[PDB]
Amino acid sequence: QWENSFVSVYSKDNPNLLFNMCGFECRILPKCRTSYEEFTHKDGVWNLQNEVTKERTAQCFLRVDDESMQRFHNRVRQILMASGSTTFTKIVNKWNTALIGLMTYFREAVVNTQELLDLLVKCENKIQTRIKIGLNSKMPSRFPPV
């Protein structure tokens, strides 16, 4: 099906080759065509290497696709809604397991996906709010991280 497919073309008009391989949305941008003063300050930007010549010739920008972000958000949601009687420890164990399920999977892409970082922080705050409501109905003004 075309609508469930993606075709990316690189030509004299397009300098970027885009594809989501296994959840990693990658944009390959050749250095030769459109680049200047290549860097390393961004941690989710794979430097490529031409094995025949051993020179930095491309640049793979990594990103976490919308499907993975939505899946993680739904996982956090079904953790939270399935908390009728689960202990706080069980909820937080599920949260940590879900977090490192993708974070060790999506490692460098998480840095470049700002919306994923916002979603992660939002879901962690949701977990904390769930626990705090479990303690007492009235949410506290402050509450220590310890």
Partner: peptide
Amino acid sequence: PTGEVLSLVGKLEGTRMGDKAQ
């Protein structure tokens, strides 16, 4: 001071993933 979690977007200027983990 508050316990609310702050998004580290814009907090990555001087940090790397492999740093402080050897």
